[PDB]
Amino acid sequence: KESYAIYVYKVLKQVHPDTGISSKAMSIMNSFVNDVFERIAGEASRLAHYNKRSTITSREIQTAVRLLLPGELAKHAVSEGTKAVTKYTSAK
Amino acid sequence: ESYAIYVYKVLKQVHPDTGISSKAMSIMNSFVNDVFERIAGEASRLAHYNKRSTITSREIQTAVRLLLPGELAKHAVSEGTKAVTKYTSA
Amino acid sequence: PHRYRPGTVALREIRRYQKSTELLIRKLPFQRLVREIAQDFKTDLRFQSSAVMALQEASEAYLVGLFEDTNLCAIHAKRVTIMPKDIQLARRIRGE
Amino acid sequence: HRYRPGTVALREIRRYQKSTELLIRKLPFQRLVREIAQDFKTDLRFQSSAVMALQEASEAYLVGLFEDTNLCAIHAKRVTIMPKDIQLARRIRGER
Amino acid sequence: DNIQGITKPAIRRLARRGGVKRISGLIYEETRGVLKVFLENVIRDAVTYTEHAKRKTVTAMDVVYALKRQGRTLYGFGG
Amino acid sequence: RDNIQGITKPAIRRLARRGGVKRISGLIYEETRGVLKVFLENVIRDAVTYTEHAKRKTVTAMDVVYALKRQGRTLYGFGG
Amino acid sequence: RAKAKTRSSRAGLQFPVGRVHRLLRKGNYAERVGAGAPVYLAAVLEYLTAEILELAGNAARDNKKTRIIPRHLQLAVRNDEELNKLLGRVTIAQGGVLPNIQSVLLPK
Amino acid sequence: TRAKAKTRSSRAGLQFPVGRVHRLLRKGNYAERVGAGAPVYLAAVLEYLTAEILELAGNAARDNKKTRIIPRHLQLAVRNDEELNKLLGRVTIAQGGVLPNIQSVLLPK
DNA sequence: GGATGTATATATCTGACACGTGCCTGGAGACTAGGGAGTATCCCCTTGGCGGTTAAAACGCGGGGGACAGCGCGTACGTGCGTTTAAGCGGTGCTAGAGCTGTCTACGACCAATTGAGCGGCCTCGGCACCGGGATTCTCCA
DNA sequence: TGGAGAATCCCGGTGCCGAGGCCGCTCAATTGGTCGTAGACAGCTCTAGCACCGCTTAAACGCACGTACGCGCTGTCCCCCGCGTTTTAACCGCCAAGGGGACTACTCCCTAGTCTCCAGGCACGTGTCAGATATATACATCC
């Protein structure tokens, strides 16, 4: 069974070095990541089906993030995603 | 592509002297599309839950049982089973 | 002259506007309100007529449902008059 | 001695909003779950985690309903909750 | 300042359709604010759906998708 | 049978104290028992439908999670 | 070959089995779609369509109208408890609301 | 013959897996095709949201003098922020509790 | 101004979090192939303006009824205390059934040819909106 | 309670536009065969679920008392409803510019598919540190 536990632990040690986490909190974080993933992927699928497109690009994920996430959260999430996409394209 | 002629066929089966307007046909077409999307999304979700890649009539049956309220669900399962039994035997 | 008691014309209006199907807000002021709301998001934006009619139908249905909940909040406080506290109570319970 | 009527309720509010534990005892809720489930399917099995998920969801639902009930009773200028407040909150949410 | 075009008799008619018998004088400003918040929430999603499609016109289907996005599904304009 | 009385009056009182209620009527408890019975009937009916679609005789936690997710009452902490 | 018989004809249905089948293929629901699932879903959609249309025709006959307008569909859906529960987050355009005045507002 | 294996997350500067998100998008029956930048974008968004939740949860744990995050701190993190409460409005956190709120009409004078 | 609920500080236990190690399997590199979409005139339709007209909105005035504050009362919850009772923990026993694996076979994807069903266009007549007259509730006042 | 007047219901005539039927035709559903794989079926294992028993103890239950509070009643005065009049601007019809949505062709680059392989991640095991608990002192509320 796959889970996001080591990744959430990596982000936690990236932002709070002397702070741990419990197993139930890790399960809640895994459920949160799965719920957000399902929401954004479903909204991107609906965006692709409405626009008669058969692919999901970064544009569909950006529009899904703007549609789902509230304001400042959406702005910072679009900034983080665009930064990651530019870093991924600049490095081969 | 619309469900207009099929809704008209069902209307003349039910109410042979009663017609339907254009806005009412648009609303009925939207109703059919919405209920189709609900049942098909529930069937897709329940296929993904049970590690199946096929939407069978059982998936549609339990999606109808999950979505529709009691008497509507019981009757809709009844015509679904009747139609599948008629289709397989003929 | 002839003068109706307060509440008779109100109940007559309730029966008249619950029997009818028409749109109650004027069309062109609502259209201008839609364009001034949309110009805060994107400039030089066009609108289909059917989009404005869809917004008006959704907004009127939302306001009528909110007024029903507001009326029941006012009746809960042993009142007939609706105040903003009834609307705020309804949107608090709905989660808005 | 005897405390005034209301202060122990305020300490109960402070010590139960500070805590996370399940306010309903496990065995009566489990027997209620198997009593309700017997009407749908006969001779069922239940995981412990399924009953705990049902209990967490039920306690969260009842706490949110009591919050809406409390603000409904405050809207009627009362500090006592009554079943009409519960019925009004369930109507405005859409559960009735 | 076209929120004042949502007139007080229009709010009175909408309350009559909701079965409201008697209306306070401060209802109308709150109703205009509620209508502005609701229209902002729907119009923002409609503009987002339009900008994803690379268009300048907000269609009725953009409004229908925006209303289905927060569970206010509208029957009669397509779908 | 008659297991709705196991949801005691102090349990409903404790839930009301968590909900911020200072004073409770005596007719609240039967109403809360009916509300809880309706909610549990809906969620357990959906979970029984889920576990009978999968040809199991055991109701799992994930079945309850999907039963609550259908009703817009998503629950974290159980693998959802 | 033989005579071309419609899949809706051998299922005893008026809704199209083939169109629902091709919408289940192209809707990106699952990788595979069985044979009896479109027959089942077409029967379910035909039943729900008949359930709304019967009460809509009854409401049109109650208002002395031969045709069905959206007001009749709104009466048909909202006046039935199961249809109001199914379509509780659905706005029917040009549908209005039911006549419902509370008892405390009527004169004594 | 083959070059050194570099992960797609390290090229994006991310900690969440790009490849797992790409696999879950491909088998999730979302679309017929999935672009290359979509898992990178989605992993970045998920990592940012995880970082925001863990920021406010670590602050809530520090305020209660505890160096481990329990579900109560996650509930404080989500419900004490307006946008995270808007994102998780229909979400119940197990063992999460409620925020301490007593109405002003119930408090003694 | 005397009586309780709880911060605050020091010791001890324990069990669950975190780190180390080994296998394994899924992601990554490299290559190819093919099809999705990105980019380059035309008619629908959206916006902008003018004039008339007339329905609706704004405004002012009177008054009446309803919100709201105060007050009394009677009762029904809150609180506290003594008795009971069954939840909770620990332990044992056993047996259904969840979950995994192997086999094979039926069934659905897929392709090619055929053909009839449904869709766009067009024409027609009848259901319904509207106007006018007159009878039937229906509300308010002396 | 009767009567004046206002609103509403019923009946008939008229015109209109939109629903309903007919027709060409094209395109999507049907038919028939093939093929590979998803899943039904049998079996086995061992995991977790159910049943039962003892005990000890926290919590529920029952009862008594009294006081806070819900609720009915009364007055008052203000705010909103009703209605007539005047202003305003919405609505309908008509007419142009012109921006922009929709269709089509092509060509290219992006992404699915596959083989190989190896390192990231998962399962397992262990020691060790963070809460939980217990008790004395003193601070913060309560009546």
Author numbering:
A (entry chain D): 31 to 122
B (entry chain H): 32 to 121
C (entry chain A): 38 to 133
D (entry chain E): 39 to 134
E (entry chain B): 24 to 102
F (entry chain F): 23 to 102
G (entry chain G): 11 to 118
H (entry chain C): 10 to 118
Wording from the paper:
The engagement of a DNA glycosylase with a damaged DNA base marks the initiation of base excision repair. Here, we report cryo-electron microscopy structures of nucleosomes bearing a deoxyinosine (DI) in various geometric positions and structures of them in complex with the DNA glycosylase AAG. The apo nucleosome structures show that the presence of a DI alone perturbs nucleosomal DNA globally, leading to a general weakening of the interface between DNA and the histone core and greater flexibility for the exit/entry of the nucleosomal DNA. Mechanistically, local distortion augmentation, translation/rotational register shift and partial opening of the nucleosome are employed by AAG to cope with substrate sites in fully exposed, occluded and completely buried positions, respectively.
The presence of DI in the –30 position of nucleosomal DNA (NCP–30I), which is solvent-facing, triggers a strong engagement of AAG, as shown in the glycerol density gradient centrifugation. Cryo-EM analysis of the AAG–NCP–30I sample obtained high-resolution structures of the NCP in both AAG-bound and -unbound states, at resolutions of 2.9 Å and 2.8 Å, respectively. In the map of the free NCP (NCP–30I), the DI in the –30 position is well resolved and forms a non-canonical base pair with the DC on the top strand, reflecting a state for the damaged nucleosome before AAG binding. In the NCP–30I, the hypoxanthine base of DI pairs to pyrimidine through weaker hydrogen bonds compared to Watson-Crick base pairs, which destabilizes local DNA and leads to a global perturbation of nucleosomal DNA. Specifically, compared to the root-mean-square deviation (RMSD) values between two canonical nucleosomal DNA backbones, the RMSD values between the damaged-strand DNA of apo NCP–30I and that of the canonical NCP are much larger, and increasing displacements are shown towards the nucleosomal DNA ends, especially at the end close to the DI. Locally, this perturbation is characterized by an outward movement of the DNA from the histone core: the calculated RMSD of the DNA backbone from –25 to –35 (–30 ± 5 positions) is 1.0 Å for both the damaged and intact strands. The presence of DI in NCP–30I causes a reduction of the buried surface area from 7141 Å2 to 6195 Å2, indicating that DI alone has significantly destabilized the interaction between the nucleosomal DNA and the octameric histone core.
